[PDB]
Amino acid sequence: DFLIKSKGYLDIQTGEIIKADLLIRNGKIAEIGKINTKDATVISIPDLILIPGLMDSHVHIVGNDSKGEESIADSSHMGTVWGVVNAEKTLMAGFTTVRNVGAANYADVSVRDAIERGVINGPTMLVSGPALGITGGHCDHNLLPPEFNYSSEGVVDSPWEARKMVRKNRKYGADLIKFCATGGVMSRNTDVNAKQFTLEEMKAIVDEAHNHGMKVAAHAHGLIGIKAAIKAGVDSVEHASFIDDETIDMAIKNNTVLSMDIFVSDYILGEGAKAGIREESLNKERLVGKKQRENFMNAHRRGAIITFGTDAGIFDHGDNAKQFAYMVEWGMTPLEAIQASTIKTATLFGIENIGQIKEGFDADIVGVIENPLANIRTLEEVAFVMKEGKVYKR
């Protein structure tokens, strides 16, 4: 049992700093206010303001981050090694629950299960397994000559094939299903504006996933794909870069969350240009970047649900909180930006008893130096992290 004495805590619903102590037992926030101090151990942390543990709705924790010629023939296990490292970095940054949204060989379930079993430290991961795509789509790997005839793990090309891949992902322990509805920036030979998958295929994916109580995320930059994903019944649209007034309203009507990664565009065009990102990808980034944040601002105003998704993996894991500054700059209040990373994500994830400092809820608590409603860039350097009643950072 822990008793947490602090400068106060953010009531995320109201936007209030409230001065109270927190009693923690069985990894849950047991009690809030003045508590009987005779009992057990005390976390004296009186200068820090406490916020609920942060959430990212779009990460790629597992994957090889080694670069250069020496890493060319690396096995898939190197990506699992990197997953361990990056899971720690994500948690230490104050992110306690994340949505891993594409990985190969179910190494994402392995890292998730290892965290859950307390083998390694990291956030609670909700994992997708291999993302589902058409032949030659964004989800497919178009880097080998046709003599190889290589298609990646999640490539499906009929409603029933798609159905079966959803079933196979669930079999090997996926929490959600992810699919590419358009082309993308980071892949080779994909049109960002063209729709990938027929609506029948998209509907089959969504129907099957929901039947198993799994939520569906859809990668979609181009407008025609965003429309189709919403119409198919997805729970979130990732990126949503060219969303217009009419289909923002479609999303509002259908409770479709818009998981928009407005920060990562600056990394790709700046730091990523000489990091090793291809020339074809940088040109597709120009088409997407500036237009996405304009649409982000419009979508928020019109009233669409937007979550905090960063596409961490492209940029460094642990730097996820840099998106908060971008989020307020493009039309959100500091409170709204933090709500997008807590209560909004919680609903999207379909997990209750997280995202709020409230009695009964899980003890996922982040301590921060300044007031986050005054300066949101304090989230970029957190000073206390507790996940499930365990302290990982001081």
Q: Which residues bind ligand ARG (CB under 6 A)?
A: 184-187, 221, 239, 241, 261, 264-265, 268, 285, 288-289, 292, 311
Question: Could you tell me which stretch among 24-32, 34-42, 100-108, 288-296 binds a second copy (CB under 8 A)?
Answer: 100-108
In this structure, are residues 366 and 382 in contact, taking their beta carbons and an 8 Å threshold? yes
Smallest separation (angstroms) from Zn ion to the CB of 144: 20
Query: Residue 264 touches which of Zn ion, a second copy, ligand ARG, none (CB < 5 to 8 A by kind)?
Result: ligand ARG
Query: Residue 265 touches which of Zn ion, ligand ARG, a second copy, none (CB < 5 to 8 A by kind)?
Result: ligand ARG
Give the one residue of 107, 127, 180, 226 binding a second copy; rule: CB under 8 A: 107
Q: Which residues pair with 29 in a beta bridge?
A: 24
In this structure, are residues 214 and 174 in contact, taking their beta carbons and an 8 Å threshold? yes
Task: Report d(CA 187, CA 97) in Å as an integer.
Answer: 27
- Residues ≥6 apart with Cβ < 8 Å to 246: none
Torsion of CA 18, 24, 28, 30, to 10 degrees: -70
- Give the dihedral sign, CA 138/141/145/151: negative
Among 185, 178, 252, CA closest to 222: 185
Q: Select 112 or 239, whichever has its Cβ closest to a second copy.
A: 112
Tell whether residue 301 is a contact of a second copy (CB under 8 A).
Answer: no
Query: Residue 198 touches which of ligand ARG, Zn ion, a second copy, none (CB < 5 to 8 A by kind)?
Result: a second copy
Smallest separation (angstroms) from a second copy to the CB of 213: 6
Among 309, 276, 278, CA closest to 185: 278
Task: Report d(CA 122, CA 53) in Å as an integer.
Answer: 12
Task: Report d(CA 321, CA 340) in Å as an integer.
Answer: 12
Total of residues contacting a second copy (CB under 8 A)? 62
| DSSP-derived secondary structure letter, 316 | P
Tell whether residue 311 is a contact of Zn ion (CB under 5 A).
Answer: yes
Task: Report d(CA 147, CA 140) in Å as an integer.
Answer: 16
Q: Select 284 or 387, whichever has its Cβ closest to ligand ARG.
A: 284
Scanning residues 123 to 152, which ones bind a second copy (CB under 8 A)?
134-137, 140, 142-147
Query: Residue 28 touches which of ligand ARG, Zn ion, a second copy, none (CB < 5 to 8 A by kind)?
Result: none
**List of residues contacting a second copy (CB under 8 A):** 65-66, 70-78, 80-85, 105-107, 109-111, 113-114, 117, 119-120, 134-137, 140, 142-147, 157-158, 160-161, 163-164, 167-168, 170-173, 188-189, 191, 194-195, 198, 207-208, 211-213
